[PDB]
Protein backbone atom coordinates (compact mmCIF):
# COMPACT_ATOMS: atom_id res chain seq x y z
CA UNK A 1 0.00 0.00 0.00
CA UNK A 2 1.00 3.61 -0.57
CA UNK A 3 2.65 5.13 2.49
CA UNK A 4 3.61 8.66 3.44
CA UNK A 5 0.65 10.36 1.70
CA UNK A 6 -1.86 12.24 3.84
CA UNK A 7 -4.97 14.28 3.02
CA UNK A 8 -5.09 17.32 5.28
CA UNK A 9 -7.89 19.89 5.52
CA UNK A 10 -7.34 22.46 2.81
CA UNK A 11 -5.59 25.78 3.44
CA UNK A 12 -4.36 24.70 6.87
CA UNK A 13 -0.98 25.31 8.47
CA UNK A 14 0.83 22.19 9.61
CA UNK A 15 4.15 21.42 11.17
CA UNK A 16 6.63 18.97 9.71
CA UNK A 17 9.68 17.74 11.63
CA UNK A 18 12.30 15.14 10.73
CA UNK A 19 14.66 13.17 12.99
CA UNK A 20 17.63 11.08 11.81
CA UNK A 21 18.87 7.73 13.21
CA UNK A 22 21.28 6.28 10.64
CA UNK A 23 24.86 6.36 9.39
CA UNK A 24 23.46 7.43 6.03
CA UNK A 25 22.66 11.05 5.26
CA UNK A 26 18.88 11.44 5.13
CA UNK A 27 17.08 13.58 2.56
CA UNK A 28 13.44 14.29 3.43
CA UNK A 29 11.25 15.86 0.77
CA UNK A 30 7.81 17.22 1.67
CA UNK A 31 5.44 17.66 -1.27
CA UNK A 32 2.25 19.72 -1.21
CA UNK A 33 -0.06 19.35 -4.21
CA UNK A 34 2.66 17.12 -5.74
CA UNK A 35 5.23 19.96 -5.67
CA UNK A 36 8.22 20.12 -3.35
CA UNK A 37 7.49 22.54 -0.50
CA UNK A 38 10.37 21.70 1.85
CA UNK A 39 13.54 19.65 1.89
CA UNK A 40 15.55 18.59 4.94
CA UNK A 41 18.97 16.93 4.85
CA UNK A 42 21.23 15.73 7.65
CA UNK A 43 22.97 12.89 9.41
CA UNK A 44 22.63 11.67 12.98
CA UNK A 45 22.53 8.38 14.87
CA UNK A 46 21.11 10.19 17.95
CA UNK A 47 17.66 11.42 16.79
CA UNK A 48 18.84 14.91 15.88
CA UNK A 49 16.26 17.21 14.31
CA UNK A 50 17.46 17.67 10.73
CA UNK A 51 14.63 20.10 9.97
CA UNK A 52 11.38 21.56 11.30
CA UNK A 53 9.09 23.85 9.34
CA UNK A 54 5.59 25.31 9.08
CA UNK A 55 3.80 24.72 5.78
CA UNK A 56 0.33 25.30 4.34
CA UNK A 57 -1.66 22.38 2.96
CA UNK A 58 -3.01 24.57 0.16
CA UNK A 59 -6.07 24.06 -1.99
CA UNK A 60 -5.59 20.31 -2.43
CA UNK A 61 -4.61 19.35 1.12
CA UNK A 62 -2.41 16.58 -0.31
CA UNK A 63 0.86 16.16 1.59
CA UNK A 64 3.44 13.52 0.67
CA UNK A 65 6.66 12.67 2.52
CA UNK A 66 9.54 11.11 0.58
CA UNK A 67 12.82 9.91 2.10
CA UNK A 68 15.99 9.02 0.23
CA UNK A 69 19.63 8.28 1.05
CA UNK A 70 22.11 9.26 -1.68
CA UNK A 71 19.29 9.20 -4.20
CA UNK A 72 17.85 5.82 -3.25
CA UNK A 73 14.24 5.91 -1.98
CA UNK A 74 13.77 4.50 1.49
CA UNK A 75 10.91 2.13 2.31
CA UNK A 76 8.19 4.02 4.21
CA UNK A 77 5.66 3.14 6.91
CA UNK A 78 2.99 5.61 7.97
CA UNK A 79 -0.31 6.19 9.73
CA UNK A 80 -2.47 9.09 10.89
CA UNK A 81 -3.84 9.31 14.45
CA UNK A 82 -6.46 11.77 15.75
CA UNK A 83 -6.87 12.55 19.45
CA UNK A 84 -10.12 14.00 20.91
CA UNK A 85 -11.42 14.33 17.34
CA UNK A 86 -9.24 17.40 16.77
CA UNK A 87 -5.49 16.90 17.26
CA UNK A 88 -3.81 15.24 14.27
CA UNK A 89 -0.52 13.41 13.85
CA UNK A 90 0.69 12.07 10.50
CA UNK A 91 3.58 9.73 11.22
CA UNK A 92 6.28 8.36 8.93
CA UNK A 93 9.08 5.90 9.51
CA UNK A 94 11.65 4.95 6.89
CA UNK A 95 14.19 2.17 6.34
CA UNK A 96 17.35 2.81 4.28
CA UNK A 97 19.01 -0.58 4.88
CA UNK A 98 18.51 -4.09 6.14
CA UNK A 99 17.92 -3.99 9.91
CA UNK A 100 14.28 -2.84 9.63
CA UNK A 101 14.26 -0.45 12.58
CA UNK A 102 12.41 2.03 10.31
CA UNK A 103 13.76 4.99 12.30
CA UNK A 104 16.43 6.10 9.81
CA UNK A 105 14.40 9.19 9.09
CA UNK A 106 11.36 9.71 11.32
CA UNK A 107 8.94 12.38 10.15
CA UNK A 108 6.12 13.85 12.24
CA UNK A 109 3.41 16.12 10.78
CA UNK A 110 1.10 17.85 13.23
CA UNK A 111 -1.94 20.09 12.98
CA UNK A 112 -3.68 22.31 13.83
CA UNK A 113 -1.09 24.91 14.75
CA UNK A 114 -1.45 28.21 16.56
Amino acid sequence: ATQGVFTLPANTRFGVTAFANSSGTQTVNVLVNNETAATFSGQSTNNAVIGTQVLNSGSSGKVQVQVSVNGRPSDLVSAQVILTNELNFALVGSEDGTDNDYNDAVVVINWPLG
Binding site: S23, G24, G97, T98
Partner: peptide, 11 residues
Protein backbone atom coordinates in the same frame (compact mmCIF):
# COMPACT_ATOMS: atom_id res chain seq x y z
CA UNK B 1 26.17 1.03 7.13
CA UNK B 2 25.70 -0.39 3.63
CA UNK B 3 27.61 -3.54 4.50
CA UNK B 4 26.02 -5.38 1.57
CA UNK B 5 27.40 -2.83 -0.89
CA UNK B 6 30.78 -3.06 0.87
CA UNK B 7 30.73 -6.87 0.66
CA UNK B 8 29.81 -6.74 -3.03
CA UNK B 9 32.72 -4.42 -3.74
CA UNK B 10 35.28 -6.39 -1.74
CA UNK B 11 34.26 -9.91 -2.79
Amino acid sequence: KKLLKLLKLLL
